[PDB]
Scaffold this active site. Structure first.
Site, PDB file in Angstrom:
ATOM      1  N   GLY A 230       0.786  -1.232   0.000  1.00  0.00           N
ATOM      2  CA  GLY A 230       0.000   0.000   0.000  1.00  0.00           C
ATOM      3  C   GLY A 230       0.818   1.282   0.000  1.00  0.00           C
ATOM      4  O   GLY A 230       0.310   2.370  -0.325  1.00  0.00           O
ATOM      5  N   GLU A 764      -2.598  36.844   6.080  1.00  0.00           N
ATOM      6  CA  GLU A 764      -2.705  38.306   6.158  1.00  0.00           C
ATOM      7  C   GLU A 764      -1.331  38.974   6.045  1.00  0.00           C
ATOM      8  O   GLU A 764      -1.191  40.025   5.400  1.00  0.00           O
ATOM      9  CB  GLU A 764      -3.394  38.719   7.451  1.00  0.00           C
ATOM     10  CG  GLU A 764      -3.389  40.204   7.674  1.00  0.00           C
ATOM     11  CD  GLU A 764      -4.252  40.615   8.836  1.00  0.00           C
ATOM     12  OE1 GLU A 764      -4.215  41.815   9.187  1.00  0.00           O
ATOM     13  OE2 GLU A 764      -4.979  39.756   9.389  1.00  0.00           O
ATOM     14  N   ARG A 842      -6.833  43.966  20.825  1.00  0.00           N
ATOM     15  CA  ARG A 842      -8.155  43.363  20.706  1.00  0.00           C
ATOM     16  C   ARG A 842      -8.457  42.465  21.909  1.00  0.00           C
ATOM     17  O   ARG A 842      -9.596  42.397  22.366  1.00  0.00           O
ATOM     18  CB  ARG A 842      -8.298  42.579  19.386  1.00  0.00           C
ATOM     19  CG  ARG A 842      -9.672  41.897  19.229  1.00  0.00           C
ATOM     20  CD  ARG A 842      -9.948  41.437  17.779  1.00  0.00           C
ATOM     21  NE  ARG A 842     -10.078  42.570  16.862  1.00  0.00           N
ATOM     22  CZ  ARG A 842     -11.215  43.232  16.640  1.00  0.00           C
ATOM     23  NH1 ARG A 842     -12.334  42.870  17.252  1.00  0.00           N
ATOM     24  NH2 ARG A 842     -11.223  44.290  15.834  1.00  0.00           N
ATOM     25  N   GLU A1223     -15.451  36.397  12.133  1.00  0.00           N
ATOM     26  CA  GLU A1223     -14.823  36.008  13.384  1.00  0.00           C
ATOM     27  C   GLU A1223     -15.678  35.886  14.632  1.00  0.00           C
ATOM     28  O   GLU A1223     -15.391  35.044  15.480  1.00  0.00           O
ATOM     29  CB  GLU A1223     -13.706  36.984  13.723  1.00  0.00           C
ATOM     30  CG  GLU A1223     -12.631  37.106  12.679  1.00  0.00           C
ATOM     31  CD  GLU A1223     -11.772  38.323  12.926  1.00  0.00           C
ATOM     32  OE1 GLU A1223     -12.245  39.453  12.644  1.00  0.00           O
ATOM     33  OE2 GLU A1223     -10.639  38.152  13.428  1.00  0.00           O
TER      34      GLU A1223
HETATM   35  C1  LIG Z   1      -3.016   8.675   7.349  1.00  0.00           C
HETATM   36  C2  LIG Z   1      -2.526   7.343   7.902  1.00  0.00           C
HETATM   37  C3  LIG Z   1      -3.202   6.808   9.010  1.00  0.00           C
HETATM   38  C4  LIG Z   1      -2.752   5.551   9.564  1.00  0.00           C
HETATM   39  N1  LIG Z   1      -3.480   5.046  10.659  1.00  0.00           N
HETATM   40  C5  LIG Z   1      -3.034   3.963  11.356  1.00  0.00           C
HETATM   41  C6  LIG Z   1      -3.648   3.475  12.574  1.00  0.00           C
HETATM   42  O1  LIG Z   1      -4.630   4.041  13.027  1.00  0.00           O
HETATM   43  N2  LIG Z   1      -3.074   2.355  13.196  1.00  0.00           N
HETATM   44  C7  LIG Z   1      -1.911   1.644  12.716  1.00  0.00           C
HETATM   45  O2  LIG Z   1      -1.469   0.693  13.305  1.00  0.00           O
HETATM   46  N3  LIG Z   1      -1.380   2.080  11.569  1.00  0.00           N
HETATM   47  C8  LIG Z   1      -1.852   3.171  10.862  1.00  0.00           C
HETATM   48  N4  LIG Z   1      -1.268   3.587   9.687  1.00  0.00           N
HETATM   49  C9  LIG Z   1      -0.078   2.885   9.214  1.00  0.00           C
HETATM   50  C10 LIG Z   1      -0.152   2.078   7.939  1.00  0.00           C
HETATM   51  O3  LIG Z   1      -1.263   2.512   7.138  1.00  0.00           O
HETATM   52  C11 LIG Z   1      -0.125   0.573   8.294  1.00  0.00           C
HETATM   53  O4  LIG Z   1       1.071   0.253   9.009  1.00  0.00           O
HETATM   54  C12 LIG Z   1      -0.312  -0.229   6.988  1.00  0.00           C
HETATM   55  O5  LIG Z   1      -1.052  -1.389   7.363  1.00  0.00           O
HETATM   56  C13 LIG Z   1       0.976  -0.644   6.319  1.00  0.00           C
HETATM   57  O6  LIG Z   1       0.559  -1.293   5.090  1.00  0.00           O
HETATM   58  P1  LIG Z   1       1.081  -0.965   3.663  1.00  0.00           P
HETATM   59  O7  LIG Z   1       0.635  -2.122   2.814  1.00  0.00           O
HETATM   60  O8  LIG Z   1       0.676   0.394   3.207  1.00  0.00           O
HETATM   61  O9  LIG Z   1       2.673  -0.996   3.851  1.00  0.00           O
HETATM   62  P2  LIG Z   1       3.957  -0.593   2.982  1.00  0.00           P
HETATM   63  O10 LIG Z   1       4.207   0.850   3.287  1.00  0.00           O
HETATM   64  O11 LIG Z   1       3.717  -1.006   1.602  1.00  0.00           O
HETATM   65  O12 LIG Z   1       4.982  -1.569   3.666  1.00  0.00           O
HETATM   66  C14 LIG Z   1       5.254  -1.413   5.052  1.00  0.00           C
HETATM   67  C15 LIG Z   1       6.463  -2.224   5.520  1.00  0.00           C
HETATM   68  O13 LIG Z   1       5.953  -3.659   5.459  1.00  0.00           O
HETATM   69  C16 LIG Z   1       6.979  -4.472   4.708  1.00  0.00           C
HETATM   70  N5  LIG Z   1       6.110  -5.508   4.149  1.00  0.00           N
HETATM   71  C17 LIG Z   1       4.898  -5.394   3.468  1.00  0.00           C
HETATM   72  N6  LIG Z   1       4.314  -6.526   3.113  1.00  0.00           N
HETATM   73  C18 LIG Z   1       5.179  -7.460   3.583  1.00  0.00           C
HETATM   74  C19 LIG Z   1       5.194  -8.952   3.579  1.00  0.00           C
HETATM   75  N7  LIG Z   1       4.191  -9.662   3.027  1.00  0.00           N
HETATM   76  N8  LIG Z   1       6.283  -9.643   4.170  1.00  0.00           N
HETATM   77  C20 LIG Z   1       7.355  -8.964   4.764  1.00  0.00           C
HETATM   78  N9  LIG Z   1       7.395  -7.586   4.810  1.00  0.00           N
HETATM   79  C21 LIG Z   1       6.329  -6.855   4.236  1.00  0.00           C
HETATM   80  C22 LIG Z   1       7.580  -3.516   3.755  1.00  0.00           C
HETATM   81  O14 LIG Z   1       8.828  -3.967   3.266  1.00  0.00           O
HETATM   82  C23 LIG Z   1       7.735  -2.231   4.609  1.00  0.00           C
HETATM   83  O15 LIG Z   1       8.813  -2.322   5.539  1.00  0.00           O
HETATM   84  C24 LIG Z   1      -1.587   4.843   8.972  1.00  0.00           C
HETATM   85  C25 LIG Z   1      -0.942   5.445   7.817  1.00  0.00           C
HETATM   86  C26 LIG Z   1      -1.372   6.658   7.270  1.00  0.00           C
HETATM   87  C27 LIG Z   1      -0.578   7.116   6.077  1.00  0.00           C
HETATM   88  N1  LIG Z   2     -14.144  29.712   4.382  1.00  0.00           N
HETATM   89  C1  LIG Z   2     -13.401  30.596   5.024  1.00  0.00           C
HETATM   90  N2  LIG Z   2     -14.022  31.459   5.904  1.00  0.00           N
HETATM   91  C2  LIG Z   2     -13.391  32.416   6.614  1.00  0.00           C
HETATM   92  C3  LIG Z   2     -11.940  32.530   6.439  1.00  0.00           C
HETATM   93  C4  LIG Z   2     -11.345  31.644   5.548  1.00  0.00           C
HETATM   94  O1  LIG Z   2     -10.033  31.774   5.394  1.00  0.00           O
HETATM   95  N3  LIG Z   2     -12.078  30.723   4.876  1.00  0.00           N
HETATM   96  N4  LIG Z   2     -11.264  33.591   7.184  1.00  0.00           N
HETATM   97  C5  LIG Z   2     -11.944  34.122   8.369  1.00  0.00           C
HETATM   98  C6  LIG Z   2     -11.311  35.365   8.857  1.00  0.00           C
HETATM   99  S1  LIG Z   2      -9.835  35.255   9.863  1.00  0.00           S
HETATM  100  C7  LIG Z   2     -11.808  36.584   8.563  1.00  0.00           C
HETATM  101  S2  LIG Z   2     -11.037  38.086   9.225  1.00  0.00           S
HETATM  102  C8  LIG Z   2     -12.956  36.843   7.713  1.00  0.00           C
HETATM  103  C9  LIG Z   2     -12.495  37.689   6.564  1.00  0.00           C
HETATM  104  O2  LIG Z   2     -13.454  37.890   5.551  1.00  0.00           O
HETATM  105  P1  LIG Z   2     -14.697  38.923   5.674  1.00  0.00           P
HETATM  106  O3  LIG Z   2     -14.165  40.220   6.152  1.00  0.00           O
HETATM  107  O4  LIG Z   2     -15.285  39.054   4.288  1.00  0.00           O
HETATM  108  O5  LIG Z   2     -15.730  38.312   6.572  1.00  0.00           O
HETATM  109  O6  LIG Z   2     -13.472  35.545   7.202  1.00  0.00           O
HETATM  110  C10 LIG Z   2     -13.430  34.426   8.150  1.00  0.00           C
HETATM  111  N5  LIG Z   2     -14.078  33.308   7.511  1.00  0.00           N
HETATM  112  O1  LIG Z   3      -8.790  43.237  14.170  1.00  0.00           O
HETATM  113  C1  LIG Z   3      -8.086  44.260  14.208  1.00  0.00           C
HETATM  114  O2  LIG Z   3      -8.415  45.091  15.050  1.00  0.00           O
HETATM  115  C2  LIG Z   3      -6.968  44.456  13.352  1.00  0.00           C
HETATM  116  C3  LIG Z   3      -6.159  45.638  13.460  1.00  0.00           C
HETATM  117  C4  LIG Z   3      -5.015  45.849  12.621  1.00  0.00           C
HETATM  118  C5  LIG Z   3      -4.688  44.860  11.657  1.00  0.00           C
HETATM  119  C6  LIG Z   3      -5.453  43.697  11.520  1.00  0.00           C
HETATM  120  C7  LIG Z   3      -6.580  43.525  12.381  1.00  0.00           C
HETATM  121  O3  LIG Z   3      -7.277  42.376  12.208  1.00  0.00           O
HETATM  122  O1  MOS Z   4      -9.029  39.216  10.972  1.00  0.00           O
HETATM  123 MO1  MOS Z   4      -8.920  37.429  10.047  1.00  0.00          MO
HETATM  124  O2  MOS Z   4      -7.849  37.595   8.728  1.00  0.00           O
HETATM  125  S1  MOS Z   4      -7.843  36.859  11.791  1.00  0.00           S
END
Ligand SMILES: Cc1cc2nc3c(=O)[nH]c(=O)nc-3n(C[C@H](O)[C@H](O)[C@H](O)COP(=O)(O)OP(=O)(O)OC[C@H]3O[C@@H](n4cnc5c(N)ncnc54)[C@H](O)[C@@H]3O)c2cc1C
Ligand SMILES: Nc1nc2c(c(=O)[nH]1)N[C@H]1C(S)=C(S)[C@@H](COP(=O)(O)O)O[C@H]1N2
Ligand SMILES: O=C(O)c1ccccc1O
Ligand code: MOS
Ligand code: MOS
Ligand code: FES
Ligand code: FES
Ligand SMILES: [Ca+2]
Lengths: 1286, 99, 50, 50
Positions: A230, A764, A842, A1223
């Site tokens: 994967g 900003e 503020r 805000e």
């Molecule tokens: C956003 C995100 C969230 C995740 N959440 C979790 C979580 O909640 N919990 C958790 O435990 N993990 C989590 N993982 C980790 C990961 O997804 C797992 O460890 C996954 O199961 C690894 O599988 P893969 O096939 O992608 O591995 P790869 O990256 O393809 O391989 C992983 C390792 O396994 C070895 N390997 C693979 N197949 C074999 C085999 N058959 N025999 C010997 N060696 C092998 C490879 O050589 C390498 O060292 C997360 C990853 C991401 C990116």
């Molecule tokens: N979807 C979205 N909404 C948002 C933001 C953003 O970045 N994305 N910025 C916030 C912030 S920090 C401010 S100051 C105001 C700015 O826009 P406005 O003066 O038109 O309300 O939008 C708020 N709402």
């Molecule tokens: O919120 C304010 O008061 C303010 C003042 C100066 C510059 C940026 C700012 O958001």
């Molecule tokens: O005043 Mo929003 O850009 S923190």
């Protein structure tokens, strides 16, 4: 090398030179020109890069569809796979797919950057289940994040697949018969047996093995070769840990590695089986087999519920998780506790062993030999008298890394409560998965009873020790979780052996969702309002359709010039140090290297920053980790990154000041003390019946806009001219800072902003860190240059919300009435001033929240530290000050023994009162918001239900809190309250409006078009706003302070009035004519159809010295009531219901305004309960990605979420009687924090002590760690001096 | 601009009208989103008509700056411009001419 | 005419709402804008000629 | 105009013009044109959206 052949949106792709390191995301965006799929993090946690993959499954003899993160999918895993991106399902140029139409019309898209990924997660669900359940719909998004919407609209609009803001009756029905067919050519290719393929890249060789024999021969010849299935671990190692595996073998096609066999002892899965497949098979087994045989299966399923999201589970293999052997694997503890069997092979050998503690000997290692591979895993059926539990507790429920995770198994002698076998295995408590063997061995032959519970808890506390320097910290919380999980297991086993005390029952229940319920109330427009007058109507964001289709262009989506180069920043790895030397000799060797830029290359000035106290590139010293020292320019982003990584900087450390406490001790501040003082404090404290003193802390916050910072700079080669495309809220400062660095007049620089995928204040000012570096690169090379920050660079360098420390003292009467208040505020400002002073002003302006305090003194100091400079973040100091105010108000209520809502009400300002800064409160609507919220939320009735729940539950508690807010509207720097517009009417009558504001998802252009259409009395269809640019409206203030609608609305309105005056003579001469007729007549009579519009907010100017003058034009108000349920044993909590009543005057657009209320509230909820940045004592940020920084997820929002806009409340101080909404609502998220505090008080009354007036400190964010630790009990206590004075 | 020196003449006109050096003035390009509905650059009248439009825009700027000049007569163009900005006076204007 | 630079146009489609930005060797940006808008069938405000 | 750098995905257009002063267009055959390396498309009146 063999050709790589796959399909994208039905079109065949033949890549003759596939590089193993190329991800699908990079290929789509850079080679295929399909920019709808986005980069949001590069680490699998945001879902912005989500696509659908379809393939013919030989084993199942069927076409399968599943989602995947394009940022982690190597294109080399996709041979004969069909990819579908957002562009492949619909577009505004052809027709939108129902998923796209509904997310757009339901107001589920604001900035739009996360929309394509969410659209694909939903689309994939529907291709698998055309009529999904509400639960399936929510689960589809475990791996998708949105920072703008607060999620509610996305789910409510999609719920349709299972006055009003939208009308579902208008939606085109889903028709599966019209979906794109699976590529016919791929269906033919399925009839040709797989052959081994070889791909050769710049640094890596990839072998796609077709048979088990090939895999074993390859591993025998190349033991070091890295297997990849994967790529969800290896991709992270390559991208973030600087690993390089020259040879990769992908065994995913091998039948034996994908086989599923139901045996007499359990179910076997080939090691390449995806976790989603394991999940489906086990769910089926749990539904068909007796409960007593599926104890282990249910444990595996409970962990899979909280394992990443759909995208990761669909590609992640079982083998990958087991062999990666991460200390926090959620599956290894379960496989170890259950003795899951592992079949391991190599050429000529085969063995099967049950997983036990010895399988993981040391950090990231397993007992496999170098030539061996894991072939299959057999998860066991449970036996009679055998029970199992698996638990995981992290920082956020959905898609998070375990803090502590476990698998627990007990086997009793036949029909008894006498232990035969006991296994307690944990992740997160050491550098590998471990078993508490010493502890469990002592219980063999013992009976399941209270003494065993006590003995095991004492044993775990001793055996699973953690030294104070344990990686990850949270020492007390982790140890408490190890005992708490065992307690849950203990009670659960008692229940299974069987009655439990009814008040203990919920401790054994696994997490359960309650169905969602959402209601939005707003005001209908007057009966006689023209259909073409859209002001007051819920018009969707004008770009929402294009955002849902992936057609909306964000900065990096702009095509690159053929000669465009890439820049990568080189930053400091020390908090404070002298730069002794810089060595680029290694970087110069990387292919495609163009140059390294540093301070000496600047032609103009190296002095930058809002207050001219920053360097463009560090000179002599670095003052924070992330301080920009220089930059590498190269031919591709990967080459620039690799070269920058090997630039070697030699440092000499200097004493550093990191914390607020460090700064105070060292008198390290920016400027002098800020202060507001009214009344007589000494007199007030003398009058008070009670006085409470305390200290409070509120952590910072990372903006996490889904689109990170980015700039493209185009040097023209003439007179110093440069045109830049930038993701910024401040084109004016971008323009002047670039000109200052180049040493050219401001009139040579053109800055253009189409839209930002989120800003939230983070763009900003800090966007110039990137803009100026890219501009220097363009100037020096003469070529266009661009840079988009990776998420980890963005979080490290660009600053965030200011952490605040407060010391307070409040005097009050027994009635709860406040008579005196002193609060000293300290903010951690980082390594430059930036907006820190205005933010503290503020904060001081809001230390009263909505309460009249006769004698009050508030001070503020900006701490100068060796951390990245903090800046504007939605709220701009207000949330911090408001939080401190509500904290002491909550303590006044507790101390007085009075209902919190009564104490708040009796201290509330009244119409006409003056604030502590002496401004009169005119049109103070908090009382109406408060009474209406109390009523619609049924606060009183629910208060008694909460008390009842707490009496009936010992290990879970509920909390409820209603809080108000007021937010002052206007820039507190007077001169920024100005706005310009430029409007042209072309001869066909079409109108182009330009104004100084920028679009970041808040719907500003939409509102300005609504305003112009009402002013001119023509349909919005005839008006268009393309972008914001410095050559159309100059000297614009940043799009900030929530006043953009107010001020640009007036400027647009004034420009329209001028146009109407010019057309009047023509309308009078031809009253029955059309707009087009009048416009053409004006043109032919030589009357100009172009004009500017301008607005200056009147009567503003406050002085801190005299405590007089108007700081704000008016205030926006609101009230929120939230109820939560906490798990006293783990720290997790549910947001049960939130009711909000907001006063936004006469809304210009209730859809956009309710979206701002929900989005702001959820960002506040994040600030106060989930989001936490962690830094080493030396000042190095640890949390640099969504894997460790947890913003609210789809599952984090209140289950019942109601928002109402106050009716009949026109605001005469702003355009069309509306009010600023950006805000103001964010602080209402604190209602969740105080409901959690209420719940913790109940848990402490239950198990801690009987002091009902006790004031325990609870800092923000109230994370699971803080919640759990505050629920003091017999477990936290388990996790001395020779003498003590009497 | 097609070689006839129209932008050169307009910068000369704006400099005389504003009483500031030509070095402080710049013309980058012609675009439909800055000046709409323009007649083609033809009939040899461009200097005549855009000269007047530029002249008029300059007069408007001078009128807006006048209060600041009167308040600080010995100040520089830069001082007056920054004072106008800080006082929230618009420094952007259109100019137009009809023969 | 024999202008030393012959006729030349670069057209950049944005992909949004019919928007297009053109760089053109012309004395008549107004008619270039309206003729391009007329051919495309979009409002004149969607076309930018520089 | 032509000195402005080309985008990496920028294409080139060549006008196809009449070789007769006055005549009916009986047919247009692009089969040989389609064989030229790099050919993308031939555009004619029916391709105009407006
Ligand atoms: C956003 C995100 C969230 C995740 N959440 C979790 C979580 O909640 N919990 C958790 O435990 N993990 C989590 N993982 C980790 C990961 O997804 C797992 O460890 C996954 O199961 C690894 O599988 P893969 O096939 O992608 O591995 P790869 O990256 O393809 O391989 C992983 C390792 O396994 C070895 N390997 C693979 N197949 C074999 C085999 N058959 N025999 C010997 N060696 C092998 C490879 O050589 C390498 O060292 C997360 C990853 C991401 C990116
Ligand atoms: N979807 C979205 N909404 C948002 C933001 C953003 O970045 N994305 N910025 C916030 C912030 S920090 C401010 S100051 C105001 C700015 O826009 P406005 O003066 O038109 O309300 O939008 C708020 N709402
Ligand atoms: O919120 C304010 O008061 C303010 C003042 C100066 C510059 C940026 C700012 O958001
Ligand atoms: O005043 Mo929003 O850009 S923190
Ligand atoms: O009038 Mo000149 O463009 S012939
Ligand atoms: S960019 Fe792929 S998950 Fe965030
Ligand atoms: S609309 Fe989802 S991140 Fe902006
Ligand atoms: Ca700062």
């Amino acid at each position: 090398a063999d050709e790589l052949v796959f399909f994208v949106n039905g079109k065949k792709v033949v890549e003759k030179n596939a590089d193993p390191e190329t991800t699908l995301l990079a290929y789509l965006r850079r080679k295929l020109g399909l920019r709808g799929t986005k980069l949001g993090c590069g680490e699998g946690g945001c879902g912005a890069c989500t696509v659908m993959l379809s393939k013919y499954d030989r084993l199942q003899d069927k076409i399968i569809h599943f989602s995947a993160n394009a940022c982690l999918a190597p294109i080399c895993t996709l041979h004969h796979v069909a990819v579908t991106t957002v562009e492949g399902i619909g577009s505004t140029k052809t027709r939108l797919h129902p998923v796209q139409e509904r997310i757009a019309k339901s107001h589920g898209s604001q900035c739009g950057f996360c929309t394509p990924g969410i659209v694909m997660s939903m689309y994939t669900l529907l291709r698998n289940q055309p009529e999904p359940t509400v639960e399936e719909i929510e689960d589809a998004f475990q791996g998708n994040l949105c920072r703008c919407t607060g999620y509610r609209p996305i789910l409510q609009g999609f719920r349709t697949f299972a006055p009003s803001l939208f009308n579902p009756e208008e939606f085109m029905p889903l028709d599966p018969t019209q979906e794109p067919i699976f590529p016919p050519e791929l269906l033919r290719l399925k009839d040709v047996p797989p052959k081994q393929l070889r791909f050769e890249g710049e640094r890596v060789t990839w072998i796609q093995a077709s048979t088990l024999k090939e895999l074993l021969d390859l591993k025998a010849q190349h033991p070091e070769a890295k297997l990849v299935v994967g790529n969800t671990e290896i991709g992270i190692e390559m991208k973030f840990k600087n690993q390089l595996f020259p040879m990769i073998i992908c065994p995913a096609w091998i039948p034996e590695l994908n086989a599923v066999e139901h045996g007499p002892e359990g179910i076997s899965f080939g090691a390449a089986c995806a976790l989603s497949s394991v999940e489906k098979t086990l769910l089926e087994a749990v539904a068909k087999l007796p409960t007593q045989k599926t104890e282990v299966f249910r444990g595996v399923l409970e962990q899979l519920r909280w394992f990443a999201g759909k995208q990761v589970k669909s590609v992640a293999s079982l083998g990958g998780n087991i062999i990666t052997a991460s200390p926090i694997s959620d599956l290894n503890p379960v496989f170890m506790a259950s003795g899951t069997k592992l079949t391991i092979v190599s050429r000529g050998t085969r063995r099967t062993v049950p997983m036990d503690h010895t399988f993981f000997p040391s950090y990231r290692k397993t007992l496999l030999g170098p030539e061996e591979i894991l072939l299959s895993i057999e998860i066991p059926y449970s036996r009679e008298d055998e029970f199992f539990s698996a638990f995981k507790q992290a920082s956020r429920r959905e898609d998070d890394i375990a803090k502590v995770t476990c698998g627990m198994r007990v086997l009793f002698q036949p029909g008894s409560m006498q232990v035969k076998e006991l296994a307690l295995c944990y992740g997160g408590m050491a550098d590998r998965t471990i078993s508490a063997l010493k502890t469990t061995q002592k219980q063999l032959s013992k009976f399941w009873n209270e003494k065993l519970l006590q003995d095991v808890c004492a044993g775990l506390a001793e055996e699973l020790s953690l030294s104070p320097d344990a990686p990850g910290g949270m020492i007390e919380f982790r140890r408490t979780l190890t005992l708490s999980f065992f307690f849950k297991f203990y009670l659960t086993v008692l229940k299974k052996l069987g009655k439990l005390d009814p008040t203990y029952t919920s401790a054994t229940l696994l997490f359960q969702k309650d169905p969602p319920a959402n209601i939005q109330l707003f005001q209908e427009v007057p009966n006689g309002q023209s259909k073409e007058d859209t002001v007051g109507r819920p018009l969707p964001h004008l770009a929402a359709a294009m955002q849902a289709s992936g057609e909306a262009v964000y900065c990096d989506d702009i095509p690159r010039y053929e000669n465009e180069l890439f820049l990568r920043l080189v930053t400091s790895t020390r908090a404070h140090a002298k730069i002794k030397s810089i060595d680029v000799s290694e970087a110069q060797k990387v292919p495609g290297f163009v140059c390294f830029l540093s301070a000496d290359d600047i032609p103009g000035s190296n002095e930058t920053g809002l207050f001219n106290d920053e360097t463009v590139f560090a000179k002599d010293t670095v003052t924070c980790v992330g301080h920009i020292i220089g930059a590498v320019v190269a031919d591709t982003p990967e080459h620039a990154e690799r070269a920058a990584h090997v630039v070697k900087v030699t440092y000499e450390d200097l004493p550093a000041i990191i914390t607020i406490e460090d700064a105070i001790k060292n008198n390290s501040f920016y400027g002098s003390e800020l202060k507001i003082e009214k009344g007589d404090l000494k007199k007030g404290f003398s009058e008070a019946d009670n006085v409470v003193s305390g200290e409070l802390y509120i952590g910072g916050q990372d903006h996490f806009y889904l689109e990170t910072h980015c700039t493209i700079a185009i040097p023209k080669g003439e007179e110093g001219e440069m045109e830049l495309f930038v993701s910024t809220q401040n084109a004016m400062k971008t323009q002047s800072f670039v000109a200052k660095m180049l040493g050219v007049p401001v009139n040579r620089i053109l800055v253009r902003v189409k839209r930002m995928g989120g800003g939230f204040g983070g763009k900003e000012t800090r966007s110039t860190l990137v803009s100026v570096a890219v501009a220097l690169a363009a100037y020096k090379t003469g070529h266009p240059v661009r840079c988009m920050l990776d998420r980890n660079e963005d979080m490290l360098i660009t600053g965030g919300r200011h952490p605040f420390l407060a010391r307070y003292k409040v005097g009050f009467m027994k009635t709860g009435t406040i008579v005196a208040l002193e609060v000293d505020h300290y903010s951690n400002a980082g390594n430059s001033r930036d907006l820190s002073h205005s933010i503290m002003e503020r904060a001081l302006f809001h230390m009263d929240n909505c309460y009249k305090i006769p004698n009050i003194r508030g001070t503020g100091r900006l701490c100068k530290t060796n951390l990245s400079s903090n800046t504007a973040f939605r709220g701009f100091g207000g949330p911090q000050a408001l939080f401190i105010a509500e904290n002491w108000m909550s303590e006044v209520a507790v101390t007085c023994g009075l209902p919190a809502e009564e104490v708040r009400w009796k201290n509330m300002y009244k119409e006409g009162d003056l604030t502590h800064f002496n401004q009169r409160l005119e049109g103070f609507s908090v009382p109406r918001c408060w009474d209406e919220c109390l009523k619609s939320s049924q606060y009183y009735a629910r208060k008694s239900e909460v008390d009842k729940f707490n009496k009936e539950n010992c290990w879970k508690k509920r909390g409820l809190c209603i809080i108000p807010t007021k937010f002052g509207i206007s820039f507190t720097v007077p001169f920024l309250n100005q706005a310009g517009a430029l409007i042209h009417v072309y001869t066909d009558g079409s109108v182009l409006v330009s104004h100084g504001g920028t679009e970041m998802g808040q719907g500003l252009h939409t509102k300005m078009v609504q305003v112009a259409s009402k002013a001119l009395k023509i349909p919005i269809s005839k008006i268009y706003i393309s972008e914001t640019s410095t050559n159309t409206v100059p000297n614009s203030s940043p799009t900030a302070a929530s006043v953009s609608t107010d001020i640009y609305g007036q400027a647009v309105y004034e420009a329209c009035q001028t146009i109407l005056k010019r057309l009047e003579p023509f309308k009078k001469k031809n009253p029955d004519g059309s707009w087009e007729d009048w416009v053409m007549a004006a043109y032919q009579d030589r009357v100009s159809l172009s004009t500017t519009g301008f607005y200056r907010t009147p009567n503003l100017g406050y002085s801190f010295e005299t405590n007089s003058g108007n700081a704000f034009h008016y205030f926006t108000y609101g009230v929120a009531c939230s109820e939560v349920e906490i798990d006293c044993l783990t720290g997790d909590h549910k947001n049960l219901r939130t009711d909000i009543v907001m006063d936004v005057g006469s809304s210009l657009n209730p859809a956009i305004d309710i979206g701002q209320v929900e989005g702001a509230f959820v960002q506040g909820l994040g600030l106060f309960t989930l989001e936490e940045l962690h830094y080493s004592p030396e000042g190095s940020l640890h949390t640099r990605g969504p894997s460790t920084y947890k913003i609210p997820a789809f599952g984090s929002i209140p289950t019942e979420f109601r928002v109402s806009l106050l009716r009949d409340c026109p605001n005469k101080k702003a355009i069309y009687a509306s009010k600023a909404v950006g805000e103001p609502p964010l602080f209402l998220g604190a209602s969740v924090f105080f409901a959690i505090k209420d719940a913790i008080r109940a848990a402490r009354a239950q198990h801690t002590n009987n002091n009902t007036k006790e004031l325990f400190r609870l800092d923000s964010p109230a994370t699971p760690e803080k919640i759990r630790n505050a629920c003091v009990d017999k477990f936290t206590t388990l996790c001395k001096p020779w003498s003590l004075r009497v």
